[PDB]
Write a protein that binds this ligand. Structure first.
Ligand SMILES: Cc1cc2nc3c(=O)[nH]c(=O)nc-3n(C[C@H](O)[C@H](O)[C@H](O)COP(=O)(O)O)c2cc1C
Ligand SMILES: CCCCCCCCO[C@@H]1O[C@H](CO)[C@@H](O)[C@H](O)[C@H]1O
Ligand SMILES: CC(=O)c1ccc(O)cc1
Length: 365
């Protein structure tokens, strides 16, 4: 009945109001030119501040880390300032907010990264994957991804430096912490999953090698802003964006244990990606619960009953609700009272302005 869902929880040096998380959700509303977070985004997040924790939509750490049109960056002074408007608005409402540091790797198109070729662990193209670009109109233009080039040792050092600085930038922008996007087939995931990584150097070939990039990026993030302000997102079983691992139970239980050693403040599991909702064995969830002992967050087709059950069964500490939060700014209140939930409009998920972003009303009987 959601009693545990409405219990507070400590997240590092922060105390959160409840166990509900607004998971990271790209809305591609950043101001142009410059991909700058803005007023409408600040209103959007502030409207949803009754969440215990808000994780921002993916925000690219550099010009070549972007995969979709109009997503907000976190590497220029104006971008940091734009995010500051957002964090000030959210904090005024009393809520913690983490910035999801993003590098899409091979999941992009040259049009989104200044005509450059995408980078990845290897030269493997993401099969049957599309992103969208700006095509001289305010409507997302979907295109097939491009074949990436394999990252060199120099590229690795550069990306780690970009992640490190992005974390500092997030703190300068007023965020309470950062979430490393190492899920949903993006750059780090392209190193983790065996079938997306055919490197013959120390970053591929063995489980230890496949987790090396994650290890080094997290080490840098923790060094920059503290483990209490670093969360990481993983996608053990979904494969929608083209990353598949041969032995995910081993790979991800190991990853969870590795992240536990870093003492990151939370581990966020993306259990469903759109309609890719693979069976995720309770036995596996319990193994993750032992491998990682910080705050464990799950997101993916949860409703009030399943969320409460997951917490009461000792599988999760917090639960994220994505699509429902898009259409219900007061999702927590609705879940607590059992008020009916509005449904979101797919057509307005990406691009455009306030319509389909800030005009979903709060519940009114
Ligand atoms: C519009 C849209 C954009 C999303 N963008 C992101 C994001 O930028 N990064 C991320 O890690 N996941 C992202 N997600 C995945 C969500 O965080 C979430 O894991 C997913 O929607 C499953 O939860 P749900 O069934 O409660 O919506 C996106 C989902 C939506 C619906
Ligand atoms: C104390 C109350 C403070 C209210 C501050 C509201 C700031 C609104 O700011 C406005 O947001 C609009 C989008 O919604 C933009 O189109 C405008 O350019 C922007 O100025
Ligand atoms: C654009 C988008 O649909 C999307 C979905 C999942 C991500 O992890 C990041 C972005």
């Amino acid at each position: 009945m959601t009693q545990s869902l409405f219990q507070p929880i400590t997240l590092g040096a922060l105390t959160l109001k409840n166990r509900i998380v607004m998971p990271p959700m790209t809305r591609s509303r950043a101001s142009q030119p410059g991909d700058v977070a803005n007023h409408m985004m600040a209103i959007y997040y502030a409207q949803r501040a009754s969440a215990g924790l808000i994780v921002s939509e993916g925000t690219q750490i550099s010009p070549t880390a972007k995969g979709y049109a109009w997503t907000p960056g976190i590497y220029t002074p104006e971008q940091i300032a734009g995010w500051r408007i957002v964090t000030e608005a959210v904090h005024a409402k009393g809520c913690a907010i983490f910035a999801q540091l993003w590098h899409v790797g091979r999941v992009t198109h040259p049009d989104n990264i200044d005509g450059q070729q995408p980078i990845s662990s290897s030269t493997l193209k993401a099969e049957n994957v599309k992103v969208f670009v700006d095509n001289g109109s305010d409507e997302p233009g979907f295109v097939d991804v491009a074949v990436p080039r394999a990252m060199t040792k120099a590229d690795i050092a550069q990306v780690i430096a970009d992640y490190r600085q992005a974390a500092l930038n997030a703190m300068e922008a007023g965020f309470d912490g950062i979430e490393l996007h190492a899920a949903n087939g993006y750059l780090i995931n392209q190193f983790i999953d065996s079938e997306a990584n055919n490197r013959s150097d120390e970053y591929g070939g063995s489980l230890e090698n496949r987790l090396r990039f994650l290890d080094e990026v997290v080490a840098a993030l923790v060094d920059a802003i503290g483990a209490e302000r670093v969360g990481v997102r993983l996608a053990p079983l979904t494969t929608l964006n083209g990353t598949v691992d041969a032995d995910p139970i081993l790979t991800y239980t190991a990853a969870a244990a590795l992240l536990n050693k870093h003492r990151i403040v939370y581990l966020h599991i993306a259990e469903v990606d759109w309609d890719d909702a693979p069976d995720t064995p309770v036995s596996f969830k319990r193994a993750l619960r032992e491998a990682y002992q910080g705050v464990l967050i799950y997101a993916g087709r949860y409703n009030a009953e399943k969320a409460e059950q997951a917490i009461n069964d000792g599988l999760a500490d917090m639960i994220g609700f994505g699509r429902p939060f898009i259409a219900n700014p007061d999702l927590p209140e609705r879940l607590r009272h059992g008020y009916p939930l509005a449904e979101h409009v797919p057509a307005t998920l990406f691009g455009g302005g306030e319509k389909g972003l800030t005009d979903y009303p709060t519940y009114q009987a």
